[PDB]
Design an enzyme around this catalytic site. Structure first.
Site, PDB file in Angstrom:
ATOM      1  N   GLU C 104       0.800  -1.215   0.000  1.00  0.00           N
ATOM      2  CA  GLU C 104       0.000   0.000   0.000  1.00  0.00           C
ATOM      3  C   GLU C 104       0.837   1.270   0.000  1.00  0.00           C
ATOM      4  OE1 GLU C 104      -2.671  -0.159   3.277  1.00  0.00           O
ATOM      5  OE2 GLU C 104      -3.233  -2.256   2.954  1.00  0.00           O
ATOM      6  N   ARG C 289      -3.124  -3.565  -9.592  1.00  0.00           N
ATOM      7  CA  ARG C 289      -2.404  -4.235  -8.510  1.00  0.00           C
ATOM      8  C   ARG C 289      -1.320  -5.173  -9.017  1.00  0.00           C
ATOM      9  NH1 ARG C 289      -2.514  -0.672  -4.666  1.00  0.00           N
ATOM     10  NH2 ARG C 289      -2.570  -1.608  -2.576  1.00  0.00           N
TER      11      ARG C 289
END
EC number: 2.1.2.13
Lengths: 656, 656, 326, 110
Positions: C104, C289
Site C-alpha cells: 500500500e 495491482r
C-alpha cells in the site's frame, strides 16, 4: 401529481396529512441525519414518513455530477419548502431551473442569518407574518406574492400562540392552494437599487450589557425563552441566566437607587424598570426572584459593573520556538504592535531580535528544543498558542545526513505536539509546501490534491514524507483527542531577512542565494528564457498578516484547517530580465556601480533538469481556505518586494 | 402546611396541574434534575407554577440531616408520592402516625420489580392500571384500594394509551381528592407475606431468540414502542430497531432469515413471523426495510449469523494490584467463577493464588509497584477496571517509620490513580475504615459523618489522613476530569486465609487468629478489663459479594459513590467470641489438639497499656449506600463465620 | 516461515507472540524457543534476543482496515514506534533485519506494474484519515534505508502482495475479521445464502499462494552470496490475475468435484440494477495491482509456480476440514 | 475546642463529598510529613500558623473577586463606595484579628 415537499414541524406534519388526504404522491424527500442530542419537543417526521413509505436518501456527495444528473432527470415541476435550511442551499443555486416557491417567516430580504424570527423580535417589532416568493438564480430576487399582518399581543401566551399558528396554517391549506397553483404571481423586480447594508449582522455573542435599553433585553429574553438556548451571563465566580420576565409600566421619574421592595426582585436600569419574574441558578431549575433577592442580600447603593473583568480575554500568550527565524522574527515584530499579546522563544541566538529588549510583553530564554525540555513542558501549559517555527533541514542535509531530518525535524516536533494534547492547547503547526511533492494539479489545493513523492531509494523525500506524517498525526490527534490545531503552508516567502549573511557558507547551498549574489557579484547570467518554471513568490508582509489572522481565530473558524499562505497570481519570469532592477540600480551611491557585460553559454549549468530531482508542473498554490477563514487576499506585488529586499540587504552590509 | 409531594415526570407535572386547579395549597414539591436524564422529553416540572408566581421549593438531596430536621420539625401528617423513584425509605415515614401515600403505576404487589410497565406488558394481559397505596414496614407492600380497568387492544398504540391513562388519572385525582381528604379508605389485608422476590429486568438478556413464540416478541416490542430508544440486537455490521409489525399467517415453515416477499419486507422465524416495516440505523434516519436492504447490498435469502450476535461479550479485564493478599485472592476466586471476566494480577508472591495459576484467564505477573511501573502503565491502558489492593501499612510499620507509609501508600497510589485519568479508565479504590478516626456518630455515614484526627504531634494519624486525602484526590478527578470511580471501605472483614500481618490491614483484627493460636495449645484465653470492646465483624463471603456487585456496576448505580461494606448488626464482645470458639472447638472429635485448659478470673495486672489509654466506642458502619447502589444486605451470622474459620485453621495447620 | 525454517537443519528460531494457537506443532521442537507475551512490556526480552540472535524479523503487524479510521493513534504507536524501537536495536548490535513493508506504499500509483526502484508513491490529502498506515510504513522504509546508508545497517525490505493460504485466520481474516473479501464469501458459502451477490465482474484481484511467498522469504533469509541486502523485493503473482466472479466460478467448479455430501446449497439473489447509494463512490484507486517480480527474479532467482486452482483447493480443504461446530 | 491548642486540639473535617476541606487536609499532611522528616531524618523545622494577620499593603485588587473574601476588604469597599454595611444578625458573629506588624515581630523571632 408530481410534487416535492420539504416539510418540518407541526405545520409540515399537518401539510403532509392534508396532502395524503388529497392523494398527491410526494416525489422524493432529501433530508440529513438527525442530531443525536437535541431538545426534540416536536414529533419524529422520519418515522412517520417511513410508515407512509416515502423513500429517504442521504446524498454523501452532493457535489457529484451524478446526483445533479439525477435531480435533473427527476424533472422537478412544483416544489414546496417549509423552513428547510431557509434558502435551501447557497453554493449551488442551480436546483431551480423553472423556479420554486419559498415560504419565509421574517422581513425579507434583510435580517439574514439564522433564527430570523427571534432576531426580528430582538429589535422589538409589532409586525410578523409569512412571505411567499419565487426562487430564482439571484438570492431574494422574487416579488412577495402576499404578506398578511398579524398583531403580536402584549400578553400572548405559548398555547394561544400555538392555536393561532394552527388556525393560520388551516386557513392557508384550506383554500389558498388554488391561488398559488393558478399562477397569480406578478413578480417584476425587487431591491437591486439600494443594496444598503445596515450593520452586517453583528453577532455580539450574548452579553447582557446594562447600557443596552431594557426594552431590547425584554425582547431577546422573550425571544430566547423556552425552548431555546437562552441568555447566559457570568460575573465574578457566579453565573446567571434570565429565563422569564414580564413587562411592566416603565417609569421616567423613578429616582433610581431607591429600592422600596425586594420581593419580587426589581432593580433599576439605564431606562425604565424591568420586572424579572423567574430565573435559573445555572446549575439547577427555575426559581422565584424573591428568594434569590433575599439570598444575595444586595442593598441600595450597590452598583453592578457592566463587565465582570474576572477572566476577560486575559493576554492571549503566544509561544514561538523559532523566534530568531525569518518568520519567527517577522511575526514577533507584528504581534508586539498590538496590546493583547505575549511572546516567547528559545532560539540559539538573538541577532535578529536585538530590537526587542525590554518591551512590556516579551520573554526570552535562549535554549534548545532537545536540551531544554522542561521549559517547553511548562510553557505549553502556561501559554495557549504554540508555534513550533523551528526546523534544521538544508537541501544539502538530505544527502549529508538524512537521519538529521528525522531525529530533529520529526521527533522533536512529535514531542512538542504531545505537549499540546496533554494540556489541551492550540498548535499552529507550520507545514511545508513540499508535501504535495510533484502533484500534477494546476492549483495545489489543500483539500483535494494528491501528494506525490518519489521512490524509497531516493534519500530526498524523507523531509516531505516526515512533514506529511506529522500533519497526519496532528489531524488524527485533533479529531480523536480534542486537539485544537491549524496547519499552514508557506509558499516561497521572500522578505528582506531571507538568509542574514553568508557566514555559514550558504552561497553554494541553493539558488536562492545565487539570486542575492546576482546583484552584487558580477554575474553575466541574465538570458534565462524563463526556465519553463512559474516562480510564484510571496512577500513576508502578506504571510505575516495571514499568520496574524490565523492566531486571532475570529470565532473559532480556523480550527482543523490546512491553509496555504502564498501568492498564486504574482509570478515573475526571471525578474523580468531585471526590469525593476534597471529602475532600482540608480539608488543613490556610485561605489561598485559598473555596467555589466553579456553572454550565454548553456541553460544546463544554471538549473537541474534531472529525473529524480524534478518538480513536475509548477509551484502555484490554491488559496481557498485563506479567503474564507481569514478573508485575506495578497496585495503587495513583486516590485515593492524586490526593491525593499535589495535596499535592506544593501543597508545590512553598511559600506564594507 | 401539610401534604408535601414527591412528584416527577410528565405525570407528576399533570398532577401538579390538577392540585393547582383544585385549589389545594401545596407549597413544597420534591424533584431531581437527573443529569443522566437524556430522554427526548426534558421533563421539567413546576414551570407553570413558577410563571404563576407561586412560591415553591426545589430540594435536591433529602437525605441530608438538615433537610430531614426541617421536614420533621413541623411534624406533618401526610406525605404524597407520585412516580418518585429512589425510595430508600427510612425513619422519617415511620415518624408520621398516618404514614405516607404512594402512587404506583401497576397492579400491586405481584411482579413489581423496577420499571413495572415491562412486567405488566410482557405477560400479555388485557387490563392494567394504577394504585394509590400506603407504606408499611416492608418494601413496596401497600394495600390496593381500587383496580382501574380501561383494557388494552393490539391495534392500540403507546401514545393513545398513555394519553388515556393521563386523562383518567387526572379525573381520578380530581374526584378522589375529597375521598383522601376525608379518608374513609377500606384497605383490605394483603398477601405480601406470600410473594416473589430476587428478580429484576436487565436489557442485556433481551437478545432476539428465534425459538420464542411470536406473542412474547409482540409483547416486548409494544412494551418498548415509541417514544423510547428501542430494544435492538447487535448483529455484524447493520443496525435496525423494531418499530412496527403486521399480523401475518403464523405458518412460515422455512428456517429463520428467509425473506418470503420483498414488498413489504417479511422475514420468517422459528415461530410466527415479524414484519419489520422500517428500522433506525444507529442515530441517523428511521427508514424503511426495502430501501435499507438495497442500500447495504444484501439480497433476499440472506440468513443472519445464527445465535452469535457479531461480537457478544468482551471479557472486561480487571487489573488487580495485590492479588496474593486477602481481598485480592478471595475476589479472584469469585471473578473466575463467572464468564466475561479476564482477571489480571501483580504481587510479590503467588503462595495463596497457587490454585489459579493454571486457569485459562488469570495472567499473573510477579513484580513490585515501583520497579515495574511500565508494566502497570501498559496494563492500566489495556484493561478496564483497576483495583489497587496494595497495602504495606501495618500499624507497627507506619508508627516505626511513617516515611514508608507516605512514599508507598500515597505516592505509589497517586501514580496508579493518575494512570486511570489519562487512559480514561474506571478505578475502584479501596479506602479504609480509619478515615472516620474519632468520629462521634453511632453509624459511620459515608456522606454525613465528620472525620476526626488527633494533633500533628501524633504520628499515628498519618495513615488515616493520607488515605483520606487520597479519596479527596480521586473525588476531585471525577469532578474536574470525568474519572469513573467507586470508593469502598472494608469494615472488619473476617474469614479464612487471614494471616497475621498479611491481612491485618485490608482484613481485620488478629482477635480470632489470636484465640485460635492460643487454643491449638494450652495457652489461656485471658481477657482484658475492657473485655466488652463490642466489635462488629464482616464475613469475607459477604464482602466479596458486595465488591463483585461494585465491579459489575449494574445500572451505573455505583458511579462516584462511597460504600461501606460491613455488618453493623453483628456485634459481639471478646467473651462471646471465645465462648462460641470453644464450643466449636470441642465439636465432635474432642481429641488431640492438646488439652484446652484456659480461664482466669482476676487478670488485672494493674495496667500495661501505653497507647491503649484511648479507645473508640462507636465503630459501626452505616450500610445504606450498599443497599441503595448494589442492593446488598449481609446474610452470614457470626457463628457460621467462627465455625468456618476454625475449620480452615484446623485443616490447614498441617501439624502432627 | 517458522515451519519452513524448522526443516532445514541449521536454524535456531526464537519466536515471541501473545499466543501459541497456530504454532502448537513446534513447541516440542528442540530449536523453537517460543515465548508468550506482547511487544509493549517485553523490551528487555526483545533487546536481549536482538543482541543474541543473528537475523531479526518484526512480523508483528497489527493493522486492521477499521483501525485505519478508528483511533489511528494506536496504529501509529504500535506500527511505527515499536518498529522504530526494534530497528534501533539492530543498529546498536549490528544485526540483520528483514522488514515487511506493505504493498500500500504505492497507493494510487498510476503505473500498471509496481516497480520498487522507479515507480512513484501517491497518497491522498491529509484530511482523509486512512493513509496514515501507508505513510507510516513508507517513513519506516525510508528510515531503514537511511540507517543502512549512514550507519552500515544490513537490511532487506520485502513487500507482500495479497498472500493467501491455510491458517489465514489470525485477526484479519476468519469470522472475527469479517471485514474481508475471501472470508466473507466463504462464510456465505458455508451457510446457505445467496452467493455471488454482485453486479458484474470486479477488478482483477491477483493472489499469491502462501507457499511461494514463504519460499521467497526463506531465500531472502538465506541471503545467498549477499546479493539481497540493501534491496526492496516485491513478492507477488503478476500472472495469477482473476476477477471475483471468475474466482467464484472456479471455486464452485472445484466444489463440484467431490462435493462431500452436497450439504451446502448455493443460491443467488437479484439486486437493483441501478445500485444507487452503494460502495462505489470514488474509491476506485487503482485497477491493476500488478507487482514487479523483476527484483525477486534477479536477487532470489524466484519465479512463482503454484497457480490459483491449487491454492483454492488447499484453502477450501483447510477451511472445510480443520474446523467444526463448537 | 474553645482554644485551638497546637498540641492537644483535635482536627475535624467534613466528609469527602465536601470539596472545601481538600485545602485543610493538604496542608495538614504537609505538617505530618515535616514532623515525620524531623524525627527520622533530623530535619530542623518550625510550623507557624498565622491565624488572621491583617495590615497595610495586603494583596492588590486582581482578576479574582476583589482579591479574596477578606471581610475587612468588604467593609473598606462599602466605605469607599458609600454602601451601607450589611449587619448580618446584627453583628453577633465575632472575629479575632491580628496586626501584620505584630505577627511579623513573631515570625522574625522564629
Amino acid at each position: 401529481m408530481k410534487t416535492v415537499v420539504f416539510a418540518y414541524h407541526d405545520m409540515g406534519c399537518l401539510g403532509i396529512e392534508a396532502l395524503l388526504a388529497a392523494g398527491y404522491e410526494i416525489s422524493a424527500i432529501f433530508t440529513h441525519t438527525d442530531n443525536p442530542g437535541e431538545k426534540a419537543f416536536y414529533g419524529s417526521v422520519a418515522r412517520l414518513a417511513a410508515e407512509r413509505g416515502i423513500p429517504v436518501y442521504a446524498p454523501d456527495n452532493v457535489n457529484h455530477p451524478l446526483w445533479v444528473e439525477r435531480i435533473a432527470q427527476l424533472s422537478p415541476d412544483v416544489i414546496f419548502s417549509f423552513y428547510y435550511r431557509h434558502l435551501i442551499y447557497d453554493e449551488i443555486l442551480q436546483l431551480a431551473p423553472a423556479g420554486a416557491f419559498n415560504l419565509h417567516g421574517s422581513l425579507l430580504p434583510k435580517y439574514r442569518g439564522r433564527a430570523p424570527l427571534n432576531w426580528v423580535l430582538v429589535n422589538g417589532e409589532t409586525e410578523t407574518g409569512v412571505t411567499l416568493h419565487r426562487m430564482v438564480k439571484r438570492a431574494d430576487a422574487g416579488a412577495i406574492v402576499a404578506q398578511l399582518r398579524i398583531a403580536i399581543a402584549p400578553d400572548d401566551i405559548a398555547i394561544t400562540l400555538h392555536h393561532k399558528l394552527c388556525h393560520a396554517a388551516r386557513q392557508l391549506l384550506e383554500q389558498t392552494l388554488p391561488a398559488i397553483k393558478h399562477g397569480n404571481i406578478l413578480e417584476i423586480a425587487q431591491r437591486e437599487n439600494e443594496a444598503t447594508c445596515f450593520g452586517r449582522r453583528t453577532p455580539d455573542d450574548s452579553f447582557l450589557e446594562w447600557h443596552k435599553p431594557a426594552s431590547v433585553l425584554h425582547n431577546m429574553v422573550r425571544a430566547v425563552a423556552d425552548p431555546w438556548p437562552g441568555a447566559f451571563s457570568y460575573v465574578g465566580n457566579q453565573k446567571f441566566t434570565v429565563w422569564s420576565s414580564r413587562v411592566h409600566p416603565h417609569a421616567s421619574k423613578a429616582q433610581p437607587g431607591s429600592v422600596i421592595s425586594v420581593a419580587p426582585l426589581l432593580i433599576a436600569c439605564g431606562d425604565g424598570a424591568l420586572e424579572i419574574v423567574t430565573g435559573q441558578a445555572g446549575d439547577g431549575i427555575t426559581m422565584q426572584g424573591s428568594q434569590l433577592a433575599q439570598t444575595l442580600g444586595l442593598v441600595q447603593g450597590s452598583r453592578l459593573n457592566s463587565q465582570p473583568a474576572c477572566t476577560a480575554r486575559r493576554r492571549t500568550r503566544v509561544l514561538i520556538l523559532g523566534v530568531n527565524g525569518f518568520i519567527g522574527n517577522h511575526l514577533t515584530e507584528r504581534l508586539l504592535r498590538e496590546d493583547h499579546y505575549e511572546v516567547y522563544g528559545l532560539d540559539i541566538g538573538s541577532d535578529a531580535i536585538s530590537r526587542f529588549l525590554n518591551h512590556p510583553h516579551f520573554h526570552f530564554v535562549e535554549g534548545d528544543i532537545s536540551i531544554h525540555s522542561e521549559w517547553i513542558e511548562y510553557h505549553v501549559k502556561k501559554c495557549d498558542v504554540v508555534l513550533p517555527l523551528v526546523a534544521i533541514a538544508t537541501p544539502i542535509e538530505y544527502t549529508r545526513n538524512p537521519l538529521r531530518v528525522f531525529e530533529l525535524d520529526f521527533e522533536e516536533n512529535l514531542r512538542i505536539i504531545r505537549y499540546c494534547v496533554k494540556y489541551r492547547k492550540r498548535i499552529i503547526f507550520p507545514s511545508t509546501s513540499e508535501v504535495y511533492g510533484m502533484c500534477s494539479d494546476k492549483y495545489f489545493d489543500e483539500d483535494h490534491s494528491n501528494l506525490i513523492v518519489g521512490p524509497v531509494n531516493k534519500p530526498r523525500w524523507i523531509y516531505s514524507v516526515s512533514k506529511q506524517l506529522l500533519d497526519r498525526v496532528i489531524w488524527a490527534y485533533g479529531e480523536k483527542e480534542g486537539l485544537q490545531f491549524t496547519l499552514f503552508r508557506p509558499f516561497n516567502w521572500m522578505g528582506p531577512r531571507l538568509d542574514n549573511l553568508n557566514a555559514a557558507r550558504i552561497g553554494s547551498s541553493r539558488a536562492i542565494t545565487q539570486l542575492i549574489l546576482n546583484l552584487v557579484e558580477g554575474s553575466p547570467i541574465k538570458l534565462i528564457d524563463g526556465g519553463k518554471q512559474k516562480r510564484c513568490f510571496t512577500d513576508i508582509r502578506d504571510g505575516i498578516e495571514a499568520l496574524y489572522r490565523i492566531i486571532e481565530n475570529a470565532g473559532n473558524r480556523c480550527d482543523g484547517e490546512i491553509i496555504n499562505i502564498g501568492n498564486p497570481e504574482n509570478e515573475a519570469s526571471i525578474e523580468e530580465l531585471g526590469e525593476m532592477l534597471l529602475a532600482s540600480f540608480e539608488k543613490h551611491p556610485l561605489r561598485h556601480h559598473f555596467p555589466p557585460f553579456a553572454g550565454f553559454r548553456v541553460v544546463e549549468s544554471s538549473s537541474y533538469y534531472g529525473k529524480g530531482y524534478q518538480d513536475v508542473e509548477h509551484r502555484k498554490p490554491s488559496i481557498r481556505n485563506a479567503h474564507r477563514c481569514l478573508d485575506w487576499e495578497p496585495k503587495i506585488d513583486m516590485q515593492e518586494t524586490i526593491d525593499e529586499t535589495l535596499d535592506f540587504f544593501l543597508r545590512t552590509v553598511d559600506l564594507t
